[PDB]
Design a protein around this ligand. Structure first.
Ligand SMILES: CCNC(=O)[C@H]1O[C@@H](n2cnc3c(N)ncnc32)[C@H](O)[C@@H]1O
Length: 225
């Protein structure tokens, strides 16, 4: 039902490099989660060219962001390809792609030579770990067409993966839930999050929404572009 894992050594080192690189630009974490969601949406859209039923578990192709100020949570949900249990373990817990190894060598060279590094993080798609700049715990709930829904969770010191006891609630796709640091509570504010989401989202080929209020209060999904 449940299983605990240590991170691969190189992933611990990569996390520290990323955190050091972006320590004074922490808002880039949201750029990278949005970019990752965009990639996951691109992937299932490409898969849909080859598999007529690829979207049958969730017909939308969106990114949806919600702030839960009362629970201290930020959620970034996409209806992209999702991850199987094995992918949650390998993709987040190990150096899974050859590009990740290249990123590490290029990152170390740049950081010792004074070349800019945030572009490298974005280029190699390794920005997931920058979520630990703002979060004490990162939770990934994911549903892939080839597996049941699973939850990955980590405070950076280990991670675990469990089958989701709620069953298939996503249909298809992934939620990144951040348990924010006390110092990061501004990311629970709708005005902060709407501005950042609007930044960072002008290049995605999918609509991105924020759950927002008007105020008498009506809540709905606000398209950010
Ligand atoms: C460097 C950390 N590794 C990843 O972020 C990998 O995790 C998977 N991943 C990250 N975010 C998502 C997401 N929103 N949907 C699907 N896969 C994801 C992709 O395979 C990424 O390349």
């Amino acid at each position: 039902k449940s299983e605990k894992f240590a991170f691969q050594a190189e992933v611990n080192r990569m996390m520290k490099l990323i955190i050091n690189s972006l320590y004074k630009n922490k808002e880039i974490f949201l750029r990278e989660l949005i970019s990752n969601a965009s990639d996951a949406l691109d992937k299932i859209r490409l898969i849909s060219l080859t598999d007529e039923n690829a979207l049958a578990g969730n017909e939308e192709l969106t990114v949806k962001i919600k702030c839960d100020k009362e629970k201290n949570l930020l959620h970034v949900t996409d209806t992209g390809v999702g991850m199987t249990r094995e992918e949650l373990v390998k993709n987040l817990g190990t150096i899974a792609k050859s590009g990740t190894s290249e990123f590490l060598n290029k990152m170390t060279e740049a950081q010792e030579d004074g070349q800019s590094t945030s572009e490298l993080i974005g280029q190699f798609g390794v920005g997931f770990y920058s979520a630990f700049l703002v979060a004490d715990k990162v939770i990934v709930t994911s549903k892939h067409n080839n597996d049941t829904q699973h939850i990955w969770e980590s405070d950076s010191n280990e991670f675990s993966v469990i089958a989701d006891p709620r069953g298939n609630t996503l249909g298809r796709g992934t939620t990144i839930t951040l348990v924010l640091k006390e110092e990061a509570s501004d990311y629970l504010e709708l005005d902060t999050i709407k501005n950042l989401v609007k930044k960072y989202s002008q290049f995605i080929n999918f609509p991105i929404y924020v759950w927002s209020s008007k105020t008498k209060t009506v809540w709905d999904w606000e398209l950010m572009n």
